Structure formats: structure tokens, C-alpha cells
């Protein structure tokens, strides 16, 4: 009669918390979703071996349309686990799955795990200075979305950092790179002429957060746009005016040019 | 030859990530600090038992003034770990310690852990809608901090949620409750009179995130200001304009007034 929402963390099968691992191990049934994101540093087989359980993967449709027909029935008389990359309920639509559980007379509990929202602290940027967050989406057909650009403008206008999630095609395992995102942003700048993102804009790139060897780079677009940040996933950040302490960390830890100590502080 | 910053998580010792546990288990020396936050569900003994190592707890002074004299010296000839609650680089100034490690010729790595910054997702509020964050600090003598009031104001004008970290005096064992935070906010409201925080302001309280049964409550200040949310730590949130799905969750899961379902578009 219990449903556990368990986060898998940032990168590999060891990014789950001990609490999450032990509880998933005691569950009769274990489901997981990999449509909101992926666990780039591991595989389903590796996650299965860690918790010692068979894992049934669920598609977006399985969850959004039939969660109550696939997961909740079993959770009525057994202990069930629902695994998701990152931290549970940070997805966006998953929170309402708890309401579904309620309607079904099922108890649900949340087992947290690291999320990129907090992991970006490794960039040396103060977490309290982050403003509204956004996602850079791939244009397609006649659709050219640009709202993420206005988000940067509004944040930077208030001296706030902007965390930009990059588009991902989970099912096809396709990731948008920090490079492509910068190209897209420059293209949007050229159309809106707001002076929000140019070759001179200072940006931070965080790749493979959760890994023991993530790529943390900071510098001006003109210099990073064609740099190789390694394998995905990549996270792009457009900082607001920096506190000297933030800048010194980007210089010392992220290889930022000394120039930022006088231009972006 | 290495220093590891390892987060212990939100509430108890099992909130550490498996990665963090495995690494800690093999370190020669393990240091820790328990002043940046409160882990209400465990003890030093249990953490020690989990990683099978003796842990030396440091004070804020030990860290801020003598980190390079107490910890770094040992990291030059051994594998050393530094443990902190939640995520080590979120709402703390520990990032700067990585610069000290560098200047001492010590390589450092960061192992993330569940953080309150992302755990707020359990309140049902969209995490991308959060704006600048702030801290509600205890007034000291004639000094009465009020900047957090302005943060709320700014976010609300943009319709963004505001995450308010609550103060903590570890050595004095003082942990600010959401009730005290609200009292302080009302006082600041009387002084500035900006109509930012009143008895009619909707608020969300999250207490002891990470435990299996955290306290999740939403409602008008007038009704929550005298409510018992249980033992600390507590965190206060002032939502901006709500999306219908956020309202439904607050009502269904956090016992908020049904009237908030009638949003003003
Ligand atoms: N489990 C928990 N539940 C509610 N609030 C919490 C919490 N853990 C931390 N906080 C909040 O955050 C403050 C400490 S700020 C340090 C936060 C830490 N690095 C992290 O990543 O979580 C506390 O005073 C409290 O207001």
C-alpha cells in the first residue's frame, strides 16, 4: 500500500542516496522513467545490479496517461518504487502523480537525491543569486521558441544568474551541447537585438555534474563557442554581475580569464 | 593527496549518496561541520558507523580561519574528506575552500547530496519559477536585517516564488522556525509598508525535508503564524502567482485553503 518516489541523482548508479538504494531493495516492484532525462554515466543494467531488482521502464505515455493503471494497482497491496533521474518532483509534471496516488488510496513518500538545481553550486556561483530558470529548445519547422532569451534578460537586468537546461531527446538519446545553445542564443540575439547574449557575454558551462571529473568552464562566448566540453549532459549558465568571490572561483577553478575580475565584477 | 567535499544530505545519515559513502569509507581522515545546517534525524555516532571512520567536527572558526592549517596539511599526504549537511556548496561559503586547497597544491573533488534548494520540489511548486533566494537572519542588538523583504518584493512583481532560508546559531543551538520568520517579516512590513508580506499573504512551510514524513503546509500567514510545524529545520516560501497545477497540489497535499484554486489570470 506504499509508493516511493526515488531520485537516482545526477550521473551514475552511485548517485542514488543510501536511503533510496535500501528502500528500492525492499520493494516488491520497481518502476523507472527515463523520458524527462537520462543517467548518462551508467546503464539500466548497472542500476538494476546495484539495487538487485528487475526494473520496468515506463514511457512518458505510460506515466502521464496510465500511471494509475500500471503503477498504482500494484502499490495497493505491495511496496512499489518509482525511480526518476535527479530529485523527485523536480521534473515538473510528477508532483501531480502524488495526487493520483491519493485519489487511489495509496500512500506515497519522497526519497530525495541531488539535482542540477543545487549541483550548479559547484560552479562557484552563489545559489541565492539564481533567478528564474529556463530551457533552451531546438527550433523546428516553423517554430522558433525564444522565451529563454527573455528570461536571461530579466534575470541579468536584476543582477541574477540564469540556469539554462539544454534540450534533450531522451528517447533518442540526443543531447544539445553547450556549443549549440550558444549558437542558438547568438541567433536569437541577432533577431531581437536586445544586447543580452553576444560574443562578449560571460558564460559558465557545467558538463557531467555528479561525475568525479566534471567539466567546469567559464569564459566569453567568442572563446567558448567552439570549445570541446566533453560528453553530455551540458548545462549552460549566463551569470549576472559577479561578486568578487564568485569571479575568483571561476578564474581559479573554472579557468576563466583574469579579465572577468575587472569586467564582470 | 586529495580532499573530498561530501554532502551528507537533508535529514539523516542515509541521505548521503552511495558515491559519497564509498569514498568516505576509504579516506584516511574525515572532518565535518554541522553549523551551516541541521540534520534533525541522525547523530554523529550513526554517521560514523555508516562510513566506519572517526569524525572530527570543526567549528565555524576552525573552518573559516584555519581550514588550511587543520585540514589541508593532512590532504597533502592522505585521502581526506570534509563532510557537510545537505550539499556542501549550497547556501554556504565552502566553495572558497576549494581555492585554498588549490593554493596548497591539494586536488579537491565535490560529491553532491540532496539539498533543500531542490527538495522544495516536494511542495508542488515549479522549481523553475523560483527567483532570487534570501535568508531571514535573527536581529542582533540594534541591527535588524531586512534585505530579504526586498527580495520577496522583487520576485513577486515578476510573479516568481521566493525561497527563504532560515537562520541558525549552531553553537547556541538556535534554529529559526517558520513562525519566527513570519513574525519578523510582519514587523518589517510595518516599517516599510510595501504590502509585500501581510496576514493575507499565502505561504508555504517545509519542515524536516528528507524525513519520510516532512511537514508540508500552505496557507495564509494569519492562520499559519501560530501553527506547530514540528522540530526544525524549517524553510519558508512565499509563492508568486500560482499555476493551477501548483494550487491543486498545495490544496491536495499541503492542506491549503480551497479558495486558492480560483486563480486570478
Ligand atoms: N531538511 C530540511 N528541511 C527544511 N529546511 C531545511 C532542511 N535542511 C536545510 N534547511 C534549511 O536551510 C537552512 C541551512 S542553509 C544550508 C543548506 C544546505 N547546503 C543544503 O544544501 O540544504 C536551514 O536553516 C533551513 O532553513
UniProtKB/Swiss-Prot annotation, chains A, B:
<feature type="binding site">
    <location>
        <position position="234"/>
    </location>
    <ligand>
        <name>S-adenosyl-L-methionine</name>
    </ligand>
</feature>
<keyword id="KW-0949">S-adenosyl-L-methionine</keyword>
<dbReference type="GO" id="GO:0004164">
    <property type="term" value="F:diphthine synthase activity"/>
</dbReference>
<protein>
    <recommendedName>
        <fullName>Diphthine synthase</fullName>
        <ecNumber>2.1.1.98</ecNumber>
    </recommendedName>
</protein>
<comment type="subunit">
    <text>Homodimer.</text>
</comment>
<feature type="binding site">
    <location>
        <position position="90"/>
    </location>
    <ligand>
        <name>S-adenosyl-L-methionine</name>
    </ligand>
</feature>
<keyword id="KW-0489">Methyltransferase</keyword>
<feature type="binding site">
    <location>
        <position position="166"/>
    </location>
    <ligand>
        <name>S-adenosyl-L-methionine</name>
    </ligand>
</feature>
<keyword id="KW-0808">Transferase</keyword>
<dbReference type="GO" id="GO:0032259">
    <property type="term" value="P:methylation"/>
</dbReference>
<comment type="function">
    <text>S-adenosyl-L-methionine-dependent methyltransferase that catalyzes the trimethylation of the amino group of the modified target histidine residue in translation elongation factor 2 (EF-2), to form an intermediate called diphthine. The three successive methylation reactions represent the second step of diphthamide biosynthesis.</text>
</comment>
<feature type="binding site">
    <location>
        <begin position="115"/>
        <end position="116"/>
    </location>
    <ligand>
        <name>S-adenosyl-L-methionine</name>
    </ligand>
</feature>
<dbReference type="InterPro" id="IPR004551">
    <property type="entry name" value="Dphthn_synthase"/>
</dbReference>
<dbReference type="Pfam" id="PF00590">
    <property type="entry name" value="TP_methylase"/>
</dbReference>
<dbReference type="InterPro" id="IPR014776">
    <property type="entry name" value="4pyrrole_Mease_sub2"/>
</dbReference>
<dbReference type="InterPro" id="IPR014777">
    <property type="entry name" value="4pyrrole_Mease_sub1"/>
</dbReference>
<feature type="binding site">
    <location>
        <position position="87"/>
    </location>
    <ligand>
        <name>S-adenosyl-L-methionine</name>
    </ligand>
</feature>
<feature type="binding site">
    <location>
        <position position="10"/>
    </location>
    <ligand>
        <name>S-adenosyl-L-methionine</name>
    </ligand>
</feature>
<comment type="pathway">
    <text>Protein modification; peptidyl-diphthamide biosynthesis.</text>
</comment>
<dbReference type="GO" id="GO:0017183">
    <property type="term" value="P:protein histidyl modification to diphthamide"/>
</dbReference>
<dbReference type="InterPro" id="IPR000878">
    <property type="entry name" value="4pyrrol_Mease"/>
</dbReference>
<dbReference type="InterPro" id="IPR035996">
    <property type="entry name" value="4pyrrol_Methylase_sf"/>
</dbReference>
<comment type="similarity">
    <text>Belongs to the diphthine synthase family.</text>
</comment>
<feature type="binding site">
    <location>
        <position position="209"/>
    </location>
    <ligand>
        <name>S-adenosyl-L-methionine</name>
    </ligand>
</feature>
Amino acid at each position: 500500500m506504499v509508493l516511493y518516489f526515488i531520485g537516482l541523482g545526477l550521473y551514475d548508479e552511485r548517485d542514488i542516496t543510501v536511503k533510496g538504494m535500501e528502500i528500492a531493495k525492499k520493494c516488491d516492484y520497481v518502476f523507472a522513467e527515463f523520458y524527462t532525462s537520462l543517467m548518462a554515466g551508467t546503464t539500466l543494467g548497472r542500476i538494476q545490479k546495484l539495487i538487485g531488482k528487475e526494473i520496468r521502464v515506463l514511457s512518458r505515455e505510460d506515466v502521464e496517461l496510465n500511471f494509475e493503471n500500471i503503477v498504482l494497482p500494484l502499490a495497493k497491496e505491495n511496496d512499489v518504487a518509482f525511480l526518476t533521474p535527479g530529485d523527485p518532483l523536480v521534473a515538473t509534471t510528477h508532483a501531480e502523480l502524488r495526487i493520483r496516488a491519493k485519489r487511489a488510496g495509496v500512500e506515497s513518500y519522497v526519497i530525495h537525491a541531488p539535482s542540477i538545481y543545487s549541483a550548479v553550486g559547484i560552479t562557484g556561483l552563489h545559489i541565492y543569486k539564481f533567478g528564474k530558470s529556463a530551457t533552451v529548445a531546438y527550433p523546428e519547422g516553423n517554430w522558433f521558441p525564444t522565451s529563454y532569451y527573455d528570461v536571461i534578460k530579466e534575470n541579468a537586468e536584476r543582477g541574477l544568474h540564469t540556469l539554462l537546461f539544454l534540450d534533450i531527446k531522451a528517447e533518442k538519446r540526443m543531447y544539445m551541447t553547450a556549443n549549440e545553445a550558444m549558437e542558438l542564443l547568438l541567433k536569437v540575439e541577432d533577431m531581437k537585438k536586445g544586447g543580452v547574449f553576444t560574443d562578449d557575454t560571460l558564460v559558465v558551462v557545467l558538463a557531467r555534474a555528479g561525475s568525479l571529473n566534471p567539466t567546469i568552464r567559464a569564459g566569453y562566448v567568442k572563446d567558448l563557442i567552439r570549445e570541446d566540453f566533453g560528453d553530455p549532459p551540458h548545462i549552460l549558465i549566463v551569470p549576472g554581475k559577479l561578486h568578487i568571490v564568485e569571479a575568483e572561483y571561476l578564474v581559479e577553478i573554472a579557468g576563466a580569464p583574469r579579465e572577468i575580475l575587472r569586467v564582470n565584477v
